[PDB]
Write a protein that binds this ligand. Structure first.
Ligand SMILES: *[C@@H]1O[C@H](CO)[C@@H](O[C@@H]2O[C@H](CO)[C@@H](O[C@@H]3O[C@H](CO)[C@@H](O)[C@H](O)[C@@H]3O)[C@H](O)[C@H]2NC(C)=O)[C@H](O)[C@H]1NC(C)=O
Ligand SMILES: *[C@@H]1O[C@H](CO)[C@@H](O[C@@H]2O[C@H](CO)[C@@H](O[C@@H]3O[C@H](CO)[C@@H](O)[C@H](O)[C@@H]3O)[C@H](O)[C@H]2NC(C)=O)[C@H](O)[C@H]1NC(C)=O
Lengths: 52, 438
């Protein structure tokens, strides 16, 4: 199976802006590892821009 | 010499323990948690997998009649039809024009590959914690594996270690669990014998090799179309295939405290919560006689730079006066600051350096080199990097010292106001006394 490219990170004040460049539908998901996490998962298809 | 302490259940945290025997020089141990495993206890309920419909060939009994016979098969269905006039490639047999019958038969059965692709329904309770701890002191390295409960003693170089039960009793697994390959789902599955068609658990088996089977898929037969032999039927699609497409999320991407869920066996690893009490029993060979340890007098502490960052962003300098050169044990008696080294090289020059990390604007703590004591105060500026890829190495204590700048200003203002109020009280009391003495 192929491995997708590493996304570009942009640091901020307790925030990360993340650039995504997929070639084909990939699954992107994140969670905050605290007491009460904040879920997410998605099927990225084209170039997007997400803040985490 | 028995001892006890508590260590945080955070992987990679450099915990250091101080032992002060009154007949020997102080000793410092290092304990680090490398790996943990929360192991729940599971009871199997039933096994679900895709089904397969078995439809035998029809038996066209003609110039006569047939009667349906009951059988003990899962979701069995049988009917007899009247008036069929079947056709085949060479022509139509069954001479009798209308006095023919066809018997249809069908039932459900477990699929061929159910023993490679199935979902399990479990009940989880009473998790058991297991850990792997690395300890070093003096010249003794080594890692050990320990059950984290008060009934397992492991000996590491002549020292007996007992790791007590966890402070908290929190588990990420609910009462009911559905396990599929390497994914764990917090799901409420229907009871055995009460499955509904089209959803999860339409067919259930008590075990993968068990002979019994309960299937409810609403299999229904229909009358064949005239002049053909096909045994029509209708059936609600499989519930397992449906569950595969709309199960939704998981526990691997949902668990709190940032701990990965794995399978075979079901466990939750590196899952930081609570405290781990430690009970120890050391022999006399580990300590050093006080005569052999160098004597340290006139210990003073100074700070060069301080930045309360996640990594060790502080430099400390100790000045002293000794008679001989050897090895001391270095420890900090407050959790506001964590030292990087546990032992230092003492020399007749009289200067040693240490590294510490803090999370408060104005830290204040007491540091000991062998038997001497000293008090350190520092002014620390915030760091500039917004985000780092490594965990914090401090205890995350923010409250500044009472001698800090902000607290000093608060003290000054409070003292001024208190002096004003005291003067008010004195004037009022003097006036009242003069009035009463009249
Ligand atoms: C060869 O073909 C002849 C076609 O006539 C077959 O004769 C049919 O035999 C069946 C079997 O007995 C008869 O059915 C019977 O019908 C009466 C009512 O008429 C009913 O009371 C009986 O209980 C039974 O169902 C059928 O009537 C008869 N055909 C005719 C036109 O009378 C014969 O069976 C065939 N040979 C073989 C070996 O199948
Ligand atoms: C007790 O034993 C452990 C394991 O043998 C020691 O940890 C090991 O320390 C050495 C360096 O002294 C590490 O080697 C270096 O690791 C870095 C990691 O980036 C690598 O880039 C270097 O090329 C070099 O291989 C070794 O990795 C490390 N082992 C583990 C599992 O982390 C430990 O130092 C011993 N205790 C004492 C007091 O020395």
């Amino acid at each position: 199976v192929p491995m997708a490219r590493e996304p570009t990170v942009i640091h901020g004040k307790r925030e990360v802006t993340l650039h995504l460049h997929p070639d084909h539908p990939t699954l992107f998901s994140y969670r905050t590892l605290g007491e009460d996490p904040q879920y997410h998962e998605e099927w990225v298809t084209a170039a997007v821009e997400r803040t985490i | 010499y028995e001892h006890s302490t508590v260590m945080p259940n955070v992987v990679g945290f450099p915990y250091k323990a101080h032992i002060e025997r009154p007949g020997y020089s102080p000793l410092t141990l290092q304990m680090q948690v490398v790996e943990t495993s929360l192991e729940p206890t599971l009871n199997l309920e039933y096994i679900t997998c895709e089904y397969k419909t078995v439809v035998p060939s029809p038996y066209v009994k003609c110039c006569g009649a047939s009667e349906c016979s009951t059988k003990e098969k899962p979701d069995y269905q049988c009917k007899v039809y009247t008036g069929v006039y079947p056709f085949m490639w060479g022509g139509a047999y069954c001479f009798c024009d209308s006095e023919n019958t066809q018997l249809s038969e069908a039932y459900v059965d477990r699929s061929d590959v159910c023993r490679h692709d199935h979902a399990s329904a479990y009940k989880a309770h009473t998790a058991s914690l297991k850990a792997k701890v690395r300890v070093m002191y003096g010249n003794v390295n080594q890692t050990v594996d320990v059950y984290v409960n008060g009934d397992h003693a492991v000996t590491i170089g002549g020292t007996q270690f007992i790791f007590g039960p966890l402070s908290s009793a929190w588990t990420p697994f609910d009462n009911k669990i559905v396990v599929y390959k390497d994914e764990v789902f917090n799901q409420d599955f229907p009871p055995y014998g009460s499955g509904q068609p089209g959803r999860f658990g339409d067919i259930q088996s008590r075990t993968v090799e068990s002979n019994d089977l309960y299937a409810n898929t609403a299999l229904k037969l229909a009358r064949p179309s005239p002049g053909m032999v096909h045994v029509p039927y209708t059936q609600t699609p499989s519930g397992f295939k449906y569950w595969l497409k709309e199960k939704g999320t998981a526990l691997n991407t949902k668990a709190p405290f940032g701990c990965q869920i794995k399978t075979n066996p079901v466990r939750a690893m590196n899952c930081a919560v609570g405290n781990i009490p430690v009970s120890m029993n050391l022999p006399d060979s580990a300590f050093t006689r006080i005569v052999e340890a160098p004597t340290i007098i006139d210990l003073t502490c100074t700070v060069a730079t301080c930045t309360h960052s996640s990594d060790f962003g502080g430099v400390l300098t100790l000045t002293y006066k000794t008679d001989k050169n050897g090895d001391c044990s270095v420890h900090s008696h407050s959790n506001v600051a964590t030292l990087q080294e546990a032992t230092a090289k003492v020399k007749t020059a009289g200067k040693v350096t240490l590294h510490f990390s803090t999370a408060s604007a104005s830290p204040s703590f007491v540091v000991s080199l062998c038997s001497a004591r000293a008090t350190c105060s520092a002014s620390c500026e915030p760091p500039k990097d917004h985000i780092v890829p490594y965990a914090a190495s401090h205890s995350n204590v923010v409250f500044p010292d009472m001698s800090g700048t902000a607290l000093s200003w608060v003290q000054k203002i409070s003292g001024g106001l208190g002096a004003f109020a005291i003067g008010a009280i004195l004037v009022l009391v003097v006036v009242t006394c003069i009035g009463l003495r009249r």
